[PDB]
UniProtKB/Swiss-Prot annotation:
Serine/threonine-protein kinase that acts as a molecular sensor for DNA damage. Involved in DNA non-homologous end joining (NHEJ) required for double-strand break (DSB) repair and V(D)J recombination. Must be bound to DNA to express its catalytic properties. Promotes processing of hairpin DNA structures in V(D)J recombination by activation of the hairpin endonuclease artemis (DCLRE1C). Recruited by XRCC5 and XRCC6 to DNA ends and is required to (1) protect and align broken ends of DNA, thereby preventing their degradation, (2) and sequester the DSB for repair by NHEJ. It is linked to Immunodeficiency 26 with or without neurologic abnormalities: A form of severe combined immunodeficiency characterized by reduced or absent T and B cells, recurrent candidiasis, and lower respiratory tract infections. Some patients show dysmorphic features, severe growth failure, microcephaly, seizures, and impaired neurological functions. This is DNA-dependent protein kinase catalytic subunit. The gene is PRKDC. Belongs to the PI3/PI4-kinase family. It comes from Homo sapiens. The chain holds residues 3540 to 3686 of 4128 of the full protein. It is found in: Nucleus; Nucleus, Nucleolus; Cytoplasm, Cytosol.
Amino acid sequence: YSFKDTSTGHKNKEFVARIKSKLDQGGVIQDFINALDQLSNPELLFKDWSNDVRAELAKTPVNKKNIEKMYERMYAALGDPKAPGLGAFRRKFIQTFGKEFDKHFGKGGSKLLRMKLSDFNDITNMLLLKMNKDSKPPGNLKECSPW
């Protein structure tokens, strides 16, 4: 939702606030929505937000807000220590993309500056290849998916 502080936006967002309070007692349906989000998306997760970033990078540098909103996806997915879901191959991928991410793609998060040129598809491709090869199917006995 994206509507303003108007006399209707006030009462409508107040109605949203009361229904939002009415449901998921203890945040357990949100725990399912999270657990199956964060685990279940294979290596191919990278390919998706990467070409989304590719499309969004053709925009003017004022798109830095959307750039950050796209970085935070993968960040909450991978970079955050003890990330929600605690995936098995998720752990493997974040372990394989720690300092490697810091070197190239995020600079600790400070890559947000360089939105002028869109060549980064090269880094995307070189990552995506080597993760496609020697990739692992999610473990046939699912016990490596703790939630």
